């Protein structure tokens, strides 16, 4: 049953499942070892001394290959897979991971997990519009001012909740394998308990894309063994969070174009449920609140209008409830709701105002009538001085016709 509506029939706020958005997806990487088969060296500590182990990275052989697929595959500790940058990727070399989500997700966290020692310098950026422009999410360094030009550990106020912080956290060369980096986009933001009511934070969390750049490795010499030991290895990459449906969907699916969109059930529309779906323009679109779900309401045209438009003046005028107005009413009816018959017509009354033929032709006599308009219901026409009837075709008792079309009836 729909989680978007309650125990009986009422709209209630709905949120998609929290997922790791990275799980399926392919991630582009600046470099990967094995291209020509190369050598790497992983260092171990048994007791107090450093013990080097050497191994072959080979992209054609499946045991020795470390493709970026291995960034997002199923993460099995028992059997483990790592993507691996080549050797001597040290500063000022970058290694960049870049990932499209193809949809606006609200991201709660970003996780990397390293088969290698953690990098000493890394940066996490998001794209908020499908890859065109990036903003920083988080910065990790031992020297923040030096590397990223960011004073480290800036206190975050209400007036910057979107500021990218640089910090020394999770930079330790230990663990030398299996180490973690987990960015929490809501960590230490001031209004983060108010996220439902804070647009800036809701905005802060939204991303279509995630880019990770490794900047500096850890030292632990210039020899070739030393160089072959310097590289990046990540076993798993995760972007955790939800699909951004504005509280107006519990799911996201593919559409005709194989794009991912919210499956919007509020009478909502567009990929984020940012707007009302057509002929629902009675009230202006709202994001869903815990207290008040706000679904677009269908405006009433009584079957005589196939189109609709919102009017702010009307809204504000009508007590801040409704609303919209119907556009061009067919079947000889006149707006707002096409709730009556156009001037020049009258009511059938043997049908209600909704019916196709509920608008009956109001036929007034070209001569006998002073105008072309019926009384809406009674059927009357504006008869001239001495005329009478429904249409005005006959002179009243005591009267007879004249040769004058202007003054058709006279007394006697």
């Amino acid at each position: 049953p729909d989680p978007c509506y309650d125990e009986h029939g009422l709209p209630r706020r709905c949120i998609p499942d929290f997922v790791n958005s990275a799980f399926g997806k392919e991630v582009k990487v600046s470099s990967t070892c094995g291209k020509p088969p190369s050598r790497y060296c992983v260092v171990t500590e048994k007791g107090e001394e450093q013990v080097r182990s050497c191994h072959l990275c080979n992209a054609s052989d499946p045991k020795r290959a470390h493709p970026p697929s291995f960034l997002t595959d199923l993460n099995n500790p028992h059997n483990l897979t790592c993507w691996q940058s080549d050797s001597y990727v040290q500063y000022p070399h970058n290694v960049t991971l870049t990932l499209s989500l193809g949809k606006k997700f609200e991201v709660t966290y970003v996780s990397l997990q390293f088969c290698s020692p953690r990098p000493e310098s890394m940066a996490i950026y998001k794209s908020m519009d499908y890859g065109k422009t990036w903003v920083p999410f988080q910065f990790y360094s031992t020297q923040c001012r030096k590397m990223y030009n960011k004073p480290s550990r800036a206190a975050i106020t209400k007036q910057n909740e979107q500021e990218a912080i640089c910090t020394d956290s999770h930079t330790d060369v230990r663990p030398l394998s299996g180490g973690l980096i987990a960015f929490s986009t809501l960590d230490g933001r001031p209004t983060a308990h108010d996220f439902d009511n804070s647009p800036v934070l809701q905005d802060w969390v939204t991303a279509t894309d995630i880019k990770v750049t490794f900047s500096r490795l850890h030292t632990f010499d210039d020899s070739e063994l030393a160089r072959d030991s310097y590289f990046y290895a990540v076993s798993d990459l995760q972007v955790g969070g939800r699909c951004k449906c504005n509280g107006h969907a519990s799911r996201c699916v593919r559409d005709r174009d194989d794009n991912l969109v919210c499956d919007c059930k509020h009478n909502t529309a567009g990929p984020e449920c940012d707007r009302c779906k057509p002929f629902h323009y009675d009230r202006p679109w709202q994001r869903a609140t815990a207290r008040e779900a706000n679904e677009c309401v269908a405006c009433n045209c009584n079957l005589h209008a196939r189109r609709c438009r919102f009017n702010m003046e009307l809204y504000k005028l009508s007590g801040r409830k409704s609303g919209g107005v119907c556009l061009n009413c067919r079947h000889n009816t006149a707006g707002r709701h096409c709730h009556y018959c156009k001037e020049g017509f009258y009511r059938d009354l043997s049908k209600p105002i909704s019916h196709r033929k509920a608008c009956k032709e109001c036929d007034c006599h070209p001569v006998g009538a002073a105008g072309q308009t019926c009384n809406q219901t009674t059927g009357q026409c504006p008869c001239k001085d001495g005329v009478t009837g429904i249409t005005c075709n006959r002179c009243a008792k005591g009267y007879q016709q004249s040769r004058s079309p202007i003054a058709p009836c006279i007394k006697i």
Binding site: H365, P366, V367, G368, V387, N393, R394, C395, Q400, Q401, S402, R403, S404, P405, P408
Partner: protein, 192 residues
Amino acid sequence: GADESQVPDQPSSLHVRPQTNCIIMSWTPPLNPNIVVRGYIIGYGVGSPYAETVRVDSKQRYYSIERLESSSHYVISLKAFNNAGEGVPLYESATTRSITDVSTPMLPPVGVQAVALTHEAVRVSWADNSVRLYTVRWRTSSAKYKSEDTTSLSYTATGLKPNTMYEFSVMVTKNRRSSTWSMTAHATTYEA
């Protein structure tokens, strides 16, 4: 039709009835049935019949030339054709009516009076300010109408059940164009 060796000879008749923005045309096949007729090429235009050309069915006796100008002298040509080719054309010319005629849509007659003559008869008269087929209708004042046409401004209704009030209306027709029902006059026939 026996043989297609040669083109069709000319159509036997052509007649054209101009409307204001339109022209109606009618015709008949050649008199000699023995030469296969596969259809007709109508052609038309202002001052010459070259502005446009229409092709039609062999069984077509009729055509309406449908988008045209007021007060314009059109010339029309008609050819019959078959595989051999097209034969000699027949022509006629017509001048479409003026938008004046459709500008003011026709209005009913005014100053209508019905005076009872007898038990079976009532005299109806009207007026007109235009200086022409008038259609009079009558009915009991449920029961339905009776129609009559006149060329004049007064008619005399006969065959009426005595001591019964009737209802009389008139319309008018000009250059095949008609107004609506004029206001009604009520007269009661005489006791016989």
